[PDB]
Symmetry: none
Subunit: 220 residues, 5 copies
Amino acid sequence: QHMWYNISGTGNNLPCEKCHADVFAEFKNNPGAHKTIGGGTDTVEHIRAACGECHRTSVVGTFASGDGTSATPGQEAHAAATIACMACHEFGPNGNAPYSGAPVAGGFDNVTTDTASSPYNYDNGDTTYGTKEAHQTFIERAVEDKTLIDSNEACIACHTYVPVKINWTHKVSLEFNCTYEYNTGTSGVTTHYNVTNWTVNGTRYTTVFGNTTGNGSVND
Amino acid sequence: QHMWYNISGTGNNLPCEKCHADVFAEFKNNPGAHKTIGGGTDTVEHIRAACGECHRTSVVGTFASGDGTSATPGQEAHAAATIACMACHEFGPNGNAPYSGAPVAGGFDNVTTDTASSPYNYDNGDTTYGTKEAHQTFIERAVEDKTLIDSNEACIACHTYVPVKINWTHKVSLEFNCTYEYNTGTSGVTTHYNVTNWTVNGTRYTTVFGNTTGNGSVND
Amino acid sequence: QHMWYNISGTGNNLPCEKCHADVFAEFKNNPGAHKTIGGGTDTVEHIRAACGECHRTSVVGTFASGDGTSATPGQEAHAAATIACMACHEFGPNGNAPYSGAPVAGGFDNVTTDTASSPYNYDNGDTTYGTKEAHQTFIERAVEDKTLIDSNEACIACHTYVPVKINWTHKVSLEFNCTYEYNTGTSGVTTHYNVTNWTVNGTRYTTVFGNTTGNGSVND
Amino acid sequence: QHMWYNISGTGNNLPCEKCHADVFAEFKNNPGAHKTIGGGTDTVEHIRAACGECHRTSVVGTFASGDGTSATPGQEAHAAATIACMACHEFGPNGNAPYSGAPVAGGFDNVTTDTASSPYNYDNGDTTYGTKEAHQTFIERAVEDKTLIDSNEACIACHTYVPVKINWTHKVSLEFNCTYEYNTGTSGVTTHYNVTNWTVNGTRYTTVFGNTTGNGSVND
Amino acid sequence: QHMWYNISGTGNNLPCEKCHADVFAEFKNNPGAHKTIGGGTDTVEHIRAACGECHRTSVVGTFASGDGTSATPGQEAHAAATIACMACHEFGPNGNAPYSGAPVAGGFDNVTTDTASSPYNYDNGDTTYGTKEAHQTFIERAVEDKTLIDSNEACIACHTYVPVKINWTHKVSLEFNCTYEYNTGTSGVTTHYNVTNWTVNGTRYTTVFGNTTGNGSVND
Ligand code: HEC
Ligand code: HEC
Ligand code: HEC
Ligand code: HEC
Ligand code: HEC
Ligand code: HEC
Ligand code: HEC
Ligand code: HEC
Ligand code: HEC
Ligand code: HEC
Ligand code: HEC
Ligand code: HEC
Ligand code: HEC
Ligand code: HEC
């Protein structure tokens, strides 16, 4: 309680690992896109730099930093701040990208619901163009419900090692009938028909559990 | 939430099956035309490649893809997009086919109704030639009513394992009468007659349910 | 919606019965000429082959067909086309018959009305010979009025299980008078007479209903 | 017991080390920010001046001091007073800093709990601005529980050579289901869905011990 | 035994040194605050006057004194009385100081234990003000245990040339755990946590010896 660390270095200086070893163990064995976000995986310092570059990046304003000789006061967060999966992957070369080299991600219409919305510009400029994302509403519902910060509830589902159990629904039957064009009777059949209506009958449920490695096992 | 997947591979990389196992189970037991659309059925990777090739094909523009080293931003859809049954089966050797090897399908007059229509060129060039499809209007009514995307409501009915219940109609009786050519009376009958009019009488209904295997059972 | 049928077989492959069971039930109990047009009646596959051979025959051009390995694009009709009762029964050994074994049917003068006509060659070559068909005009009036395709409105009337109600007409009386050959008077009668004119008087109607089995009941 | 020390010097005069040698040994080997808070580390007098400047600074009022010729009576503490880690690092150039050169530290919302609070002004003026500190509540809980004076229980945890053992918690599984938009059945799937609810299942524990040098070893 | 001393002088007259030479030798080499309490150090008479002024001051009542011509009977002590370190340093200008020029010392809350207490008024009037003395209880425990008169056991420890050996104690480890706010699972981590409890583990000892000159040597 009298020999506090030296923070004279650049970037993150104190060890984030004094209380966060489990996340370190998880991240050291990551084959994902960001193995080299910190410039390496073999050394502990590279992983610490990666954590600094992700959880202390240029999000809103300068974080808290210093080098013994001087210290820059923290503006909106001292140690670290949780950031959305997308705040880095929002704009690339078209606008002012957060990281030079970061690829602008996806392409969806801007999530503007009746209750909540997101400040990030989804359309990336091609507002009339990018609209045919089938999943789409998966992101919208995640944005609507505040479970993870901003839009991570759905974005983390299918890129990460996160097991998920979901309840699928699909009705047993959907069917339809058929009418004639003003003529029918003792003729076997009219020359032409017409079809209208599409009715429904009987309901089915489905549940599936997915493991960490992505294998899909259904408990049908 | 710190060990996201590797997408360095070509084509679809992450497992689509983390949330879609039931469709995998359905498709693995498919004896239909597209058992080998993904190059195989025995391995899971082949089925994943098939799903990529169908739901992420060249429809409008490049989908979202990457390999860790670089990433191509998605243009109109990030993960996958629902596509009509016909968007692949629309043109073959005559025009620019979507798949080299895909057979141009069917042959109908272009669906141009009073309200809606389809951009796909049905006639395949032989506009004056292909017209005598009896079913025809079945496709037109499916196009008119937006239940499935574009023209799948009817196209999926008779090629797939989709049970259907329809209400058939045919009137009980259609009949007609007979006139003479200016001569008749106490002669038994004139040398020649003429027949006109075709009238109707009494109505009949019919309903039929079809199972998955195509067996036709009618509840007459 | 992911396990569509296999069409690798020859001829019709998918089951036509997924939506047409009532016609199957009607045709299975047919004692008519075409019980064995499909090579059998006991098996469902034989009936399906019969439907293919009738509604998908060589009429104008190749229909749509395939076997998984390859697919032949449909030329003028994809699934099936309505065909006239006669298009098969038009020419036999004299010309190019549609079916080897099909018997050329009937024999009438070519229907060439003032408004419409038929491309099928009725006379079968013996143009000066086949002319004394009493019914004849029954076919002509059916051709004139587009109720069934081409010339089926009359052709289906007396060969099929189709109940018909018609209004017969015949005048009550047709009679005539008588003149002498320049001589008459107080002689009782002349040696010879002459007869001219044939007049008419009073009108009668008649209506008859015929059941499926051909029994003739008249509501006189 | 008759030759008491001379305190004629400025600042701290008597040796604090007559009973506090272990803390001296600990502080002499400090590579942290405050090696030169006393103007040196090599001489004992510099370390004594550092202890005076830290534990006898201008906190509330003048401490006890004298020079033989005169003595200033102690106001609220004679020898030394324990001071919070932050009482020096609370305000810099904006307000009246305690040390000219001391950097204002961190940036958090003012800790105003339902039970206790702190008089130090955390927001530093930018009340609406500094709010996105992820750790935040770590400081609040330390303030709530009186284990160290004011807000040192958490502030000393990650800057100092203080080994810590904590029990991490994270539940085994969190998952969710899925509903259709009024349409489903024998259609394979509806054009669009909706997703609601996020459920939980099974619990996991985690414990980690951290050494003096900051190495993170987890006993998973 | 017939030529007893002359005490006609003022103050102390007989030589205190006839039996107390060692204390004289100790005090002659004193660089502390009271070199000139007797008005000098060079002459023996000045040191004798200092001893008189300290051990024969106005404490409770007049001591024993005389000048041959007259003698004042001793009231509570004839030769000298042991006095507490503080009885002179208790009140200055606020109350009735013992010496005009004596500085009121320190500032602590009044020592009022469950068993013993002191009549001297510690708070000096600022009862609500002077409370933040960290050492504080060091004086209280000295007052509780009668080893030196009143409150000298601790007061003599850190101002005088008195070597001390003390046994320090501090436990090896004190640590804590962490809980979530109603949400956790397959989400990597919840948006926010909570921390409770502070546990202990393993014990450490420490002993230190301090010499006359104040150098701190620890036998760790
Ligand atoms: C008492 C509550 C605290 C005070 C006073 C300060 N901190 Fe911290 N701190 C933390 C990190 C991760 C850094 C990196 C900064 C760098 O690399 O220079 C810092 C830095 C500082 C600094 C210098 C930089 C600046 O002034 O902005 C000061 C003066 C400072 N800290 C004061 C992390 C943490 C932390 C982890 C949860 C806690 C509890 C504290 N800091 C507490 C205090
Ligand atoms: C937060 C909402 C998300 C961000 C940011 C990104 N995604 Fe995805 N994603 C998905 C698939 C099926 C792929 C295949 C691409 C490939 O094979 O390379 C991807 C890929 C990416 C990429 C790299 C490729 C590119 O930039 O176009 C990035 C940068 C990316 N994704 C960012 C699928 C999904 C998905 C399933 C429903 C979700 C929720 C997300 N992606 C979310 C995000
Ligand atoms: C979406 C509107 C459709 C597409 C695309 C295709 N069909 Fe069909 N189909 C039907 C039958 C009775 C057959 C028999 C052909 C055979 O036995 O091989 C077929 C066949 C095909 C084929 C392969 C043969 C070919 O290309 O000509 C393709 C590529 C094909 N179909 C594409 C019947 C029906 C049907 C019943 C009313 C409908 C709605 C569709 N087909 C729809 C589509
Ligand atoms: C008997 C209980 C005590 C009396 C009477 C005094 N002290 Fe102390 N003391 C201590 C320190 C660290 C200082 C520094 C002051 C300086 O540098 O001038 C002092 C100083 C004094 C002074 C002069 C200054 C003043 O009057 O404020 C006086 C008159 C004085 N002290 C009287 C520390 C300690 C200590 C360490 C735990 C103890 C037990 C005492 N002092 C006890 C007494
Ligand atoms: C022990 C003193 C820690 C050190 C060293 C670091 N962190 Fe931490 N962190 C700690 C706790 C007890 C918690 C949970 C408490 C809470 O109120 O949530 C956290 C949490 C985080 C988070 C997420 C915050 C949240 O989800 O609520 C992040 C992003 C985080 N910590 C980052 C982080 C970094 C980058 C560190 C190195 C500078 C670091 N932490 C060190 C305790 C401790
Ligand atoms: C007044 C007696 C202080 C107390 C109590 C604490 N700090 Fe300090 N700090 C003070 C000054 C005047 C300065 C700037 C001059 C200097 O020599 O640094 C600082 C600076 C720091 C820094 C900056 C270096 C860096 O962050 O890398 C840090 C980290 C720092 N102080 C930490 C710190 C901690 C953890 C404290 C409580 C145990 C603490 N300081 C108390 C003055 C004072
Ligand atoms: C869980 C994180 C999923 C993963 C992994 C994949 N998909 Fe998905 N998909 C998911 C949901 C919850 C839904 C329905 C939600 C909705 O708004 O509709 C879907 C739906 C589809 C669809 C059809 C869209 C529709 O009919 O509305 C398609 C074509 C689809 N998904 C494709 C697809 C592919 C190719 C995947 C591998 C890259 C894949 N999905 C993964 C959830 C999840
Ligand atoms: C800023 C700190 C980022 C955050 C937050 C996320 N990503 Fe990232 N990403 C970033 C950069 C600078 C790059 C390009 C450089 C590189 O080393 O890749 C990327 C790249 C990706 C990729 C590309 C590889 C691939 O797609 O196969 C993917 C898939 C990716 N990022 C995913 C991803 C996810 C799921 C994130 C939220 C958990 C995420 N990134 C956050 C910068 C940043
Ligand atoms: C349900 C998906 C069907 C399947 C399987 C088959 N047919 Fe069909 N047919 C269907 C409907 C809804 C209609 C009437 C709609 C209309 O627009 O007329 C028909 C009609 C026919 C006809 C006559 C057309 C007419 O008179 O207008 C024929 C000759 C016909 N169908 C043939 C046929 C064959 C051979 C099939 C097996 C390949 C077959 N149909 C399957 C619906 C469905
Ligand atoms: C592009 C992703 C396609 C989609 C969408 C559909 N089909 Fe397909 N089809 C495609 C190719 C490249 C081929 C030829 C190569 C092969 O392996 O077959 C086909 C072929 C068929 C066939 C031929 C076999 C047969 O008819 O017996 C059929 C019947 C067929 N396809 C049917 C079909 C249906 C019903 C579709 C919508 C659900 C459909 N295809 C979509 C490429 C693509
Ligand atoms: C081609 C698909 C045909 C259609 C359309 C019709 N007929 Fe047919 N018919 C065809 C063949 C190849 C044969 C000879 C082989 C055989 O199994 O009969 C026939 C035969 C007849 C007969 C002969 C038996 C008899 O007259 O007693 C009759 C009566 C007959 N066909 C009637 C008929 C009718 C009424 C049709 C329209 C509803 C019709 N045929 C169509 C081939 C084809
Ligand atoms: C022996 C006579 C000591 C001298 C010389 C100094 N200190 Fe001390 N200190 C001593 C003891 C026996 C204790 C613990 C007793 C208690 O009641 O706590 C302390 C404690 C402190 C503390 C912390 C108080 C606490 O945490 O309770 C501080 C800040 C402190 N001491 C400072 C200090 C300084 C600056 C000194 C030089 C003037 C000094 N001490 C000398 C015993 C002795
Ligand atoms: C009355 C006989 C006293 C006794 C008993 C003690 N002190 Fe004293 N002290 C007294 C006076 C009149 C003065 C001021 C005049 C002077 O010459 O100093 C003092 C002063 C001090 C000082 C001030 C110098 C400094 O603190 O640096 C100190 C430190 C001091 N006194 C200490 C001290 C101690 C430790 C005593 C008990 C052993 C003690 N004094 C007793 C009068 C009297
Ligand atoms: C020999 C005849 C002495 C003369 C001359 C002085 N003192 Fe003394 N003193 C003497 C003895 C044998 C003792 C200890 C005996 C005992 O019962 O304690 C003392 C003790 C003191 C003390 C402290 C008393 C104690 O701690 O118990 C004091 C304060 C003291 N003496 C003062 C003192 C003064 C001021 C003298 C000059 C007038 C003086 N003493 C002379 C023996 C002798």
